[PDB]
From Swiss-Prot:
Subunit structure of this chain's protein: 3 different light chains, LC1 (a cleavage product of MAP1B), LC2 (a cleavage product of MAP1A) and LC3 (produced by one of the MAP1LC3 genes), can associate with the MAP1A or MAP1B heavy chains. Interacts with TP53INP1 and TP53INP2. Directly interacts with SQSTM1; this interaction leads to MAP1LC3A recruitment to inclusion bodies containing polyubiquitinated protein aggregates and to inclusion body degradation by autophagy. Interacts with ATG13. Interacts with ULK1. Interacts with TBC1D5. Found in a complex with UBQLN1 and UBQLN2. Interacts with UBQLN4 (via STI1 1 and 2 domains).
KW Repeat (keyword) present: no
Keyword tags: Autophagy, Cytoplasm, Cytoplasmic vesicle, Cytoskeleton, Lipoprotein, Membrane, Microtubule, Phosphoprotein, Ubl conjugation pathway
GO molecular function, one term: microtubule binding
Region (Important for interaction with ATG13 and for autophagosome formation): 55-59
Modifications made to the protein after synthesis: The precursor molecule is cleaved by ATG4 (ATG4A, ATG4B, ATG4C or ATG4D) to expose the glycine at the C-terminus and form the cytosolic form, LC3-I. The processed form is then activated by APG7L/ATG7, transferred to ATG3 and conjugated to phosphatidylethanolamine (PE) phospholipid to form the membrane-bound form, LC3-II. During non-canonical autophagy, the processed form is conjugated to phosphatidylserine (PS) phospholipid. ATG4 proteins also mediate the delipidation of PE-conjugated forms. (Microbial infection) The Legionella effector RavZ is a deconjugating enzyme that hydrolyzes the amide bond between the C-terminal glycine residue and an adjacent aromatic residue in ATG8 proteins conjugated to phosphatidylethanolamine (PE), producing an ATG8 protein that is resistant to reconjugation by the host machinery due to the cleavage of the reactive C-terminal glycine. RavZ is also able to mediate delipidation of ATG8 proteins conjugated to phosphatidylserine (PS).
The organism of origin for this protein: Homo sapiens (Human)
Protein name: Microtubule-associated protein 1 light chain 3 alpha
SUPFAM superfamilies attached to this UniProt entry: Ubiquitin-like
Tissue-specific expression: Most abundant in heart, brain, liver, skeletal muscle and testis but absent in thymus and peripheral blood leukocytes.
Family classification: Belongs to the ATG8 family.
Length: 122
C-alpha cells in the first residue's frame, strides 16, 4: 500500500547532479573550450515574482561582461524594460556591469568549477 512521491522538477543544480558529475562536467568543457566560462544561473531561493527559466547552464565566452549577460537573461525572461532585475554572484553580490565574466570566474567559481549566479527582484 505504498504511495510513492515524484521528485520535483525545478530543484537547484547542486541538488540534481552529484559533486563528481558537476566536476566531471566542468572538466570536459575546460578541455574542449578552455577560454569559455561555465555558469549556472538559477532563480533566487525564495523569489516569487520572477519566472523560472528553463536554461540554467550558460557557456559564456571570455570577453562577455555582466551587462551582456543581464540583457540576455532579461530578454529570455521576456521581461519588461521597467521591471528591475539583479544578477548576483555567490548568493548576494552585485557585480559591476562592466566586468568581463572571465575576470569574475577565478575569484568566484565554486568548488566544482562552475560559476553560480542567481537572479532576483527583492
Amino acid at each position: 500500500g505504498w504511495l510513492i512521491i515524484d521528485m520535483p522538477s525545478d530543484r537547484p543544480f547542486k541538488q540534481r547532479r552529484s559533486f563528481a558529475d558537476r566536476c566531471k562536467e566542468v572538466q570536459q568543457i575546460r578541455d574542449q573550450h578552455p577560454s569559455k566560462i561555465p555558469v549556472i544561473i538559477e532563480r533566487y531561493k525564495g523569489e516569487k515574482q520572477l519566472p523560472v527559466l528553463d536554461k540554467t547552464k550558460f557557456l559564456v565566452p571570455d570577453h562577455v561582461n555582466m551587462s551582456e549577460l543581464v540583457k540576455i537573461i532579461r530578454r529570455r525572461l521576456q521581461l519588461n524594460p521597467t521591471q528591475a532585475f539583479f544578477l548576483l554572484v555567490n548568493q548576494h553580490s552585485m557585480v559591476s556591469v562592466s566586468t568581463p565574466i572571465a575576470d569574475i570566474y577565478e575569484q568566484e567559481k565554486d568548488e566544482d568549477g562552475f560559476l553560480y549566479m542567481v537572479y532576483a527582484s527583492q
